[PDB]
Amino acid sequence: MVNPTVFFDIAVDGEPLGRVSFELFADKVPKTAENFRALSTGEKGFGYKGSCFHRIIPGFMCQGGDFTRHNGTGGKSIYGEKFEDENFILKHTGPGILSMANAGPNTNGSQFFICTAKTEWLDGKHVVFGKVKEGMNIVEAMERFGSRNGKTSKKITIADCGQLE
Template sequence: MDVKGSVIFETTVGTIAFELYKDHAPKSCENFYQLAKRGYYNGTKASDNQLYNATSQKSHWCYFDFMIQGGDPTATGRGGMSIYGEKFEDEISPALKHTGAGILSMANSGPNTNGSQFFITLAPTPWLDGKHTIFGRVSAGMNVVKRTGMVQTDANDKPKQDVIIVRARVVE
């Protein structure tokens, strides 16, 4: 699980490891890696189909059999900054597709609006291809991702039970 250049999330449900695709999305990988290294995601809440970042924040939305999303310190779906400033450009690779569960991608609000938010797919999501930068995959802990994706949500797709990212760390 501890592969050089990877990112590890220790959550209240278990541990998730991410392999980063530095050759395909160098800026997105560096952003995620540095935010994890700086503790940006520590203490944040993640549940059901959304993991959330920033200190002690709640997940915003959850979508059963779709994704878990996180990385917004405001827990509104509109917050979070990248290491480059507010937003940075997409790094879409035609070779990478949202073909199944465990794909790590940048969440955004349109072209070139990447910040700190990310998502992990729970199923194939081909309609996201070409719209979201894929920058890695879950390399260990897919059972944790699946359990997180099964947390019950309310009518607004917000998790009823928080899953907390206790600590994010990097393997150097």
């Protein structure tokens, strides 16, 4: 039935910032939503708890999910391999959209980004699979620690994460 909700508790240099929660569009992109959900609960033995947002570009997006190499070169899905672009039904319409980062067609792993603006040029290239439900203000606060080239000025971490309800 109803789409799952997951949360991230964000810290900045180890200090609590706040919680961001997401609605995952399992009704439209079930395989992609499931990967992110499971990575958020940690139920497979690995996932996002303790990982960082390693690339944040103000006015554009905050990117994370590289829990293996911590820098954009790693991550892994729950499927034992990278997975296909499920569909491109949903578009990058504005702030708060949750979408998969990738290195080309059919290469989804665990990396994802949260848009801070409408990023329509990514439509058909990145699978949109959720949106911020609560704590977009916390994403805005994280965005302030980014820079033009994406390097963050403080370490932005997922101190805790899980599924709500």
